Amino acid sequence: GSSGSSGMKHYEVEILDAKTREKLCFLDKVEPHATIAEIKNLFTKTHPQWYPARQSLRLDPKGKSLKDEDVLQKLPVGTTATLYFRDL
Protein backbone atom coordinates (compact mmCIF):
# COMPACT_ATOMS: atom_id res chain seq x y z
CA GLY A 1 0.00 0.00 0.00
CA SER A 2 1.00 3.61 0.61
CA SER A 3 1.19 3.85 4.40
CA GLY A 4 2.80 7.23 3.81
CA SER A 5 5.90 7.79 1.69
CA SER A 6 8.64 10.41 1.38
CA GLY A 7 8.96 12.06 -2.02
CA MET A 8 12.35 13.40 -3.10
CA LYS A 9 12.49 15.91 -5.96
CA HIS A 10 16.20 15.30 -6.58
CA TYR A 11 17.90 15.15 -9.98
CA GLU A 12 18.42 11.89 -11.87
CA VAL A 13 21.85 11.52 -13.47
CA GLU A 14 22.65 8.21 -15.16
CA ILE A 15 26.36 8.05 -15.98
CA LEU A 16 26.53 5.77 -19.02
CA ASP A 17 29.52 4.66 -21.09
CA ALA A 18 30.56 6.28 -24.37
CA LYS A 19 31.07 2.86 -25.95
CA THR A 20 28.91 0.15 -24.38
CA ARG A 21 26.54 2.77 -22.95
CA GLU A 22 26.15 0.52 -19.91
CA LYS A 23 24.80 1.78 -16.58
CA LEU A 24 27.87 2.39 -14.42
CA CYS A 25 26.40 4.62 -11.71
CA PHE A 26 23.00 6.11 -10.89
CA LEU A 27 22.78 9.28 -8.79
CA ASP A 28 19.13 10.11 -8.15
CA LYS A 29 20.14 12.37 -5.27
CA VAL A 30 22.03 15.13 -7.09
CA GLU A 31 21.45 18.85 -6.59
CA PRO A 32 20.34 21.11 -9.48
CA HIS A 33 22.75 23.91 -8.57
CA ALA A 34 25.51 21.30 -8.37
CA THR A 35 28.23 21.90 -10.95
CA ILE A 36 29.72 19.16 -13.13
CA ALA A 37 32.76 19.28 -10.85
CA GLU A 38 30.67 18.15 -7.88
CA ILE A 39 29.15 15.35 -9.96
CA LYS A 40 32.57 13.70 -10.25
CA ASN A 41 33.11 13.80 -6.48
CA LEU A 42 29.90 11.82 -6.00
CA PHE A 43 30.90 8.97 -8.31
CA THR A 44 34.07 8.86 -6.22
CA LYS A 45 32.16 8.25 -2.99
CA THR A 46 31.24 4.67 -3.92
CA HIS A 47 34.44 4.02 -5.87
CA PRO A 48 37.30 5.91 -4.17
CA GLN A 49 39.98 4.17 -6.24
CA TRP A 50 38.55 6.04 -9.23
CA TYR A 51 39.74 9.65 -9.29
CA PRO A 52 38.15 12.59 -11.15
CA ALA A 53 41.34 13.22 -13.13
CA ARG A 54 40.16 10.24 -15.17
CA GLN A 55 36.35 10.24 -15.19
CA SER A 56 35.58 12.09 -18.42
CA LEU A 57 32.02 13.37 -18.76
CA ARG A 58 30.53 14.49 -22.08
CA LEU A 59 27.07 15.73 -23.05
CA ASP A 60 27.41 13.44 -26.06
CA PRO A 61 29.52 10.45 -27.20
CA LYS A 62 30.63 12.55 -30.17
CA GLY A 63 30.96 15.96 -28.55
CA LYS A 64 33.48 17.34 -26.08
CA SER A 65 34.47 17.14 -22.41
CA LEU A 66 32.18 18.91 -19.94
CA LYS A 67 33.44 21.65 -17.62
CA ASP A 68 32.51 22.55 -14.05
CA GLU A 69 31.07 25.78 -15.45
CA ASP A 70 28.14 23.67 -16.66
CA VAL A 71 25.37 22.98 -14.14
CA LEU A 72 22.59 20.41 -13.79
CA GLN A 73 20.24 23.38 -14.13
CA LYS A 74 22.17 25.33 -16.76
CA LEU A 75 22.81 22.37 -19.06
CA PRO A 76 20.49 21.83 -22.06
CA VAL A 77 18.95 18.98 -20.06
CA GLY A 78 16.13 18.64 -17.55
CA THR A 79 15.59 16.80 -14.27
CA THR A 80 16.96 13.67 -15.94
CA ALA A 81 20.51 14.43 -17.08
CA THR A 82 22.69 11.99 -19.01
CA LEU A 83 26.49 11.92 -18.86
CA TYR A 84 28.90 9.81 -20.91
CA PHE A 85 32.07 8.35 -19.40
CA ARG A 86 35.32 7.89 -21.32
CA ASP A 87 38.25 5.77 -20.15
CA LEU A 88 41.53 7.70 -20.15
Cα separation of 22 and 59, whole Å? 16
Helices within the chain (DSSP H only):
36-46
CATH number among 3.10.20.90, 2.130.10.10, 3.40.50.970, 3.80.10.10, domain 1-88: 3.10.20.90
d(CA 84, CA 22): 10
**Burial track 60-72 (b if 16+ CB lie within 10 A, e otherwise):** eeeeeebeeebbb
Q: Where are the domains of the chain?
A: 1-88
Experimental technique: NMR
Q: Which amino acid is at 80?
A: T
